[PDB]
Amino acid sequence: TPKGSSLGTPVNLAVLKLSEQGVLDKLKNKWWYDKGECGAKDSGSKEK
Amino acid sequence: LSARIVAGVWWFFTLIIISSYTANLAAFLTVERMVSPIESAED
Secondary structure, eight states: OOTTOSSHHHHHHHHHHHHHHTHHHHHHHIIIIISOSOOOSSOSSSOO | OHHHHHHHHHHHHHHHHHHHHHHHHHHHHHHOTTOOSOOOTTO
8 A cells, every 4th residue: 555545553453353253264265276277285295 | 736836935935025024114113103193183
């Protein structure tokens, strides 16, 4: 945001509120995992 | 004539098998098994 703008505080509180609501987690999960290829998520004992 | 080659391929096979079993048993007797009950939250 621009220095000392009137939009700083509201978008700030917005970001916090969205993060707490779970919007950010769900959204990131959406564009990273939900839409994505080879989604096995460590399947067939890949760690061992 | 068939029993000689059958017993030979069989003896050879089980020899490979016991060598593998012993080798791997020593391997597990050494490695300390790398035990990990849980990995990820998905588990």
